[PDB]
Amino acid sequence: RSSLRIRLFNFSLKLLTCLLYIVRVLLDDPALGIGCWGCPKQNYSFNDSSSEINWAPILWVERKMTLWAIQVIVAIISFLETMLLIYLSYKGNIWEQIFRVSFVLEMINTLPFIITIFWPPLR
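RESULT FIELD:
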């Protein structure tokens, strides 16, 4: 039953990172300042008259030094285990894994944490 333990751990990992996202949004205050990771954080306001919307608040969310690293760690383990299962079980088909709609959500929500390591300004 070791395979069931692996999926149970992965299920715990996915619910843990979603809750850590809640922890982030609870401790992320935009009015203090929103910017690109250090220098130039810029305060913002919303104008109902001007139809243009500023994307910097949406594009940018402040992440704590502890929070960004632990999410990267959790994402990597979830990334490791899912492709541990993918490489473990082929069952006579190498294709069709990405068209089943679970690979896209796993990959699009995980590797961005991997690429943020390369660029400190993108954390």
